[PDB]
Design a protein around this ligand. Sequence first.
Ligand SMILES: CC(C)=CCC/C(C)=C/CC/C(C)=C/COP(=O)(O)OP(=O)(O)O
Lengths: 228, 228
Amino acid sequence: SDLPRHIAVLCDGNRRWARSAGYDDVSYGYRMGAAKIAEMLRWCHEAGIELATVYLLSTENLQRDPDELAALIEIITDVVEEICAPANHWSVRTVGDLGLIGEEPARRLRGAVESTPEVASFHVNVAVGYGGRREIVDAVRALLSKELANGATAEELVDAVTVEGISENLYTSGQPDPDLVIRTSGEQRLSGFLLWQSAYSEMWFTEAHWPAFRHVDFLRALRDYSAR
Amino acid sequence: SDLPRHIAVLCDGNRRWARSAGYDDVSYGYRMGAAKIAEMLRWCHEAGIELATVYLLSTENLQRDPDELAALIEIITDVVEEICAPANHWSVRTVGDLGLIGEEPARRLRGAVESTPEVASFHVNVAVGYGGRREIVDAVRALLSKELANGATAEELVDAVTVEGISENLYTSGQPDPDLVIRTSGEQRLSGFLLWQSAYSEMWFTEAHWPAFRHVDFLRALRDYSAR
Ligand SMILES: CC(C)=CCC/C(C)=C/CC/C(C)=C/COP(=O)(O)OP(=O)(O)O
């Protein structure tokens, strides 16, 4: 009630944090961000949040220097393997397109996520190779494919698309929409993250870069959410 | 001046403003809010903003009391008739479904908007009977119907949908996406307003209720945007 069912987190500021700290290698920032993802998910679970979505890799991110992108993707893969650790008993789902990150990372991520239970008290979505407008397009495509496979005419395809039909074909099919979306780094935008799903979400902003995010920042987010 | 090309405004807090100011009849908030809409649009025009979208009526707002809704719809009709006054020489477009507001108001709104020039220095979108997810669905339907008209087979329709195709079939077809979205009354959500189009918009919030929104606040918004 006063607590979000589903919290979504956009983890901005990793490179800026590394520069501010005087590191020449921005992977120091991503590594600390990775540590904070692990912490944040523990906080959500213990607070009684049912589902958390973390934005690990956007389609924008994939346009980066090959070598920096490679190291980032390795960090992300370690993050997901950590999220999927058996002792957590968290149910994990990928949100996005693993066809974009390389086959070795994709195999590692898929394997980790597939090892987690379907039914659990806490669920984690890891958004990797994700874009919100793209997700909608792919939802519509999936919807139309199913209708065609079940014998729809071209004319019937034209009318088959509905709000509920799109919702049911997103990556987040069958999950509650995010109640609270957290963005860091003073960035006051959505950047298409869970675009369809977050239409009615509460937004909460901090100036802190993601690697600098603290448990008390999480407490403030929940406090503010409850107050609203 | 780094001005937004397109500013979108969610005019929240009208009834809360009225109650706080000791008005027993909260419809009065809508009348003060209507006066402020005209003034905001003047400020936008004078500042050199090319396009402004104002949120006048959501599909959800139609769930209100008949007396309150009746007043609100008449007030909205007045607002639009003012926006469309020939002395303004503003180009106006309806964003939403006028079939949701009743035949007689719909007739008046359409007449007013149709009377405005296609070409002008300042453009205003009036969002009436609008929902963001519905807009996307209707854009996809429009897109598919056009492909079918051009002779596409059902097999071909399944893969006809693209990001660009959806954008070109929204109410805002041919317009730039919003650069800045303003919401009042301390409300930190988008409520599906220009859902697709505002994926990458800057969000700006004030605690001021809409009827209390002043030019100094507008300048703050532009200052904060320029500083993003
Ligand atoms: C003349 C004048 C001042 C007209 C404006 C009056 C009016 C109805 C403003 C509402 C704008 C708005 C923020 C809608 C979104 O609320 P929502 O109910 O659709 O969604 P929500 O529940 O998340 O807020």
